[PDB]
Structure 1
Amino acid sequence: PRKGPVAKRDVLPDPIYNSKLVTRLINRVMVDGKRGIAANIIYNSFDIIKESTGNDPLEVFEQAMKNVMPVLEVKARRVGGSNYQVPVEVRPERRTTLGLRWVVNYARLRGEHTMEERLAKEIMDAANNTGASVKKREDTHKMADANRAFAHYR
């Protein structure tokens, strides 16, 4: 925080897929400590994955990671009382965390009646350049490089 860098807390893999990434995916769904309900609806999401255009239950999640994950972001690095924010390359763990945030934390807005059609089909859509989280990254890269000239020298 002030003195030095802090530890980062690597996690435990799944009880089924033996994945840390899917574990972290569960943990950015979990509200009020109800882990079993979020875990079970994510296994239900994998069951919806497996039936409708069943290709691979995990490659669809990796392609959902493909079409979302950033490479650029601006950061307000002024020096002498300016507003010269610099498009900066992102840390890789923060990159994946922004990807999980753009997948799940945008999926509140589908508004369909079945309670996990906003989850399962939503991450089905992100595998093949659909879902509005892809265009979130698109407009993020387009508002990036808006100061490509007068900020990349720092």
Structure 2
Amino acid sequence: PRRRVIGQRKILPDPKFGSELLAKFVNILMVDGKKSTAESIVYSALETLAQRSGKSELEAFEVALENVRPTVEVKSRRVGGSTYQVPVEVRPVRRNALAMRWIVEAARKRGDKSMALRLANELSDAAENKGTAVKKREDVHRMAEANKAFA
């Protein structure tokens, strides 16, 4: 807020093998608060991803996120006059959460059969970085590299 310097809260780890980042991926999937359905969809999508790729559940999801991981992002910081976008490096806690948000936002569209199949197909397309969330990343990168001279 304005003065409050409170930090992030400590969420519960996932009831599968211990990884808090995929628990945050469970947390940002969640329509209508339905956490149990979100955990079932994440679990089934990680099994159908580890089956089609041959990797584990913690390392196929590891290299699915660095292809949707943005480098810098733009935000409006005007200083006395004209309003221009400012490219800046994002903090990693915001970075990986926004990348998972991009994965889920790409998973909301492109409806093949069901939500677990959509999430597995989005992670499979982010494996060889030709899907939709990597296009969101390349669009955020196109917002930079030409408006980069303002610093």
Q: Same fold (TM over 0.5)?
A: yes
Paired residue for 1:133? 133
Paired residue for 2:13? 13
Give CA deviations for 1:50-70 in whole Å, capped at 9, x if unaligned: 322322222111111110011
Paired residue for 1:58? 58
SS of 1:122 mapped into structure 2: helix
Q: Is the 8 A contact 1:63 1:128 kept in 2?
A: no
* Structure whose residues are more often helix by fraction: 2
Q: Post-superposition shift, 1:48?
A: 0.7
Q: Is the 8 A contact 1:50 1:56 kept in 2?
A: yes
Unaligned runs of at least 5 residues, structure 1: none
Q: Is the 8 A contact 1:60 1:124 kept in 2?
A: no
Q: Post-superposition shift, 1:148?
A: 2.1
Distance 1:68 1:29 in 2: 16
Paired residue for 2:37? 37
Q: Post-superposition shift, 1:130?
A: 2.2
Letter of the aligned partner of 1:52 in structure 2? R
Paired residue for 1:69? 69
Q: Is the 8 A contact 2:106 2:122 kept in 1?
A: no
Q: Is the 8 A contact 2:107 2:115 kept in 1?
A: no
SS of 1:24 mapped into structure 2: helix
Q: Is the 8 A contact 1:50 1:57 kept in 2?
A: yes
Distance 1:108 1:70 in 2: 20
SS of 2:96 mapped into structure 1: helix
Q: Is the 8 A contact 1:62 1:127 kept in 2?
A: no
Q: CA RMSD in A?
A: 1.5
Tell me how many residue pairs correspond in the alignment.
151
Paired residue for 2:103? 103
> Which TM-score applies when normalising by structure 2?
0.91
Higher Cα Rg, which structure: 1
Q: 1:130 to 1:147 in 2, by over 3 A?
A: closer
- Fraction of identical pairs, as percent: 51
SS of 1:87 mapped into structure 2: strand
Distance 2:90 2:48 in 1: 33
Distance 1:53 1:147 in 2: 38
Distance 2:34 2:114 in 1: 20
